Amino acid sequence: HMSICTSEEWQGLMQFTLPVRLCKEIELFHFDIGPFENMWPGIFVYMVHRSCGTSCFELEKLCRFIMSVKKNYRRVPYHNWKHAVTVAHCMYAILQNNHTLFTDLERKGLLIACLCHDLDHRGFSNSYLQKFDHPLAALYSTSTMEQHHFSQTVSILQLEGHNIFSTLSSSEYEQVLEIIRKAIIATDLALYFGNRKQLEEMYQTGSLNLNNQSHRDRVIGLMMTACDLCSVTKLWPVTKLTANDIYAEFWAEGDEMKKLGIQPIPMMDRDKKDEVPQGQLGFYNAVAIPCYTTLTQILPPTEPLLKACRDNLSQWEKVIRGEE
Ligand SMILES: [Mg+2]
Ligand SMILES: [Zn+2]
């Protein structure tokens, strides 16, 4: 049940050279991949090499993994192949600015987990699949699609020559799958709120501590929500265009509810276009600013994410004022 990538796809990826004017701009947080669609797989290659190293993964295997991941993502409006790399790039930019704070096995896990973090997303949220007794929701009582994303991640590895972790020992093999599993479940927004409050509680008292493993996982969890929502940290017109992709997936999910007879939540109602700016304003205050505030407190050189989020909050505030 996994789409195997062709030789022509991953061969052309090995041969790919990164343009020198992108080598500079890849490092910056605000960097928008959007314009360079044909270059995306090779930009993930570059990001792995710059963080982990050239001999980190066997280049032939890594290129099969990437192009088979791309093939397993569906063509929904938002949770798609484009999303995977934008989130994986945010992680890269964080990891670069806090490098020896994490291990090489963590670096391997989090980028790979970011690129696979929404594998085979059907366009539909957890609550929709749970409320209409979907086979996936029966399989996973809490965090439905996130567990499916982790399952699809592990299925890709088990294909012929796709297992990038063959050269690791089985000690570090089950560690990297546990880092990846933990990181992919953290992306379920439901758990972020508890995760943030806890880390805020741990920060202010002074009891937070990086080699305390339980704290380390919460810190990695926050990074995976900061990355998963990183479209709010981009430039203003990029962010406006991305939210239009996000709502297009919400409104299709809301169309499916109106057919069955039950009217959806206003966020997934396409008649409620008027509420969007006020709905964003809420999202930035109760989720986004909070996410990047406690991120900047743990890791000071992830402040640009918080800075550009303040900037985009101002723009969303101005849209309610009637300026735009
Ligand atoms: Mg998700
Ligand atoms: Zn996501």
UniProtKB/Swiss-Prot annotation:
The active site is at H79. It is found in: Cytoplasm, Cytosol. Residues 6-323 form the PDEase domain. Abundant in the putamen and caudate nucleus regions of brain and testis, moderately expressed in the thyroid gland, pituitary gland, thalamus and cerebellum. 3',5'-cyclic GMP binds at H79, Q280. A divalent metal cation 1 binds at H83, H117, D118, D228. A divalent metal cation 2 binds at D118. 3',5'-cyclic AMP binds at H79, Q280. Belongs to the cyclic nucleotide phosphodiesterase family. The tandem GAF domains bind cAMP, and regulate enzyme activity. The binding of cAMP stimulates enzyme activity. Composed of a C-terminal catalytic domain containing two divalent metal sites and an N-terminal regulatory domain which contains one cyclic nucleotide-binding region. Homodimer. It is linked to Dyskinesia, limb and orofacial, infantile-onset: An autosomal recessive, early-onset hyperkinetic movement disorder characterized by axial hypotonia, dyskinesia of the limbs and trunk, orofacial dyskinesia, drooling, and dysarthria. The severity of the hyperkinesis is variable. Plays a role in signal transduction by regulating the intracellular concentration of cyclic nucleotides. Can hydrolyze both cAMP and cGMP, but has higher affinity for cAMP and is more efficient with cAMP as substrate. May play a critical role in regulating cAMP and cGMP levels in the striatum, a region of the brain that contributes to the control of movement and cognition. This is cAMP and cAMP-inhibited cGMP 3',5'-cyclic phosphodiesterase 10A. It comes from Homo sapiens. The lineage of its organism: Eukaryota, Metazoa, Chordata, Craniata, Vertebrata. The gene is PDE10A. The chain holds residues 715 to 1036 of 1055 of the full protein.
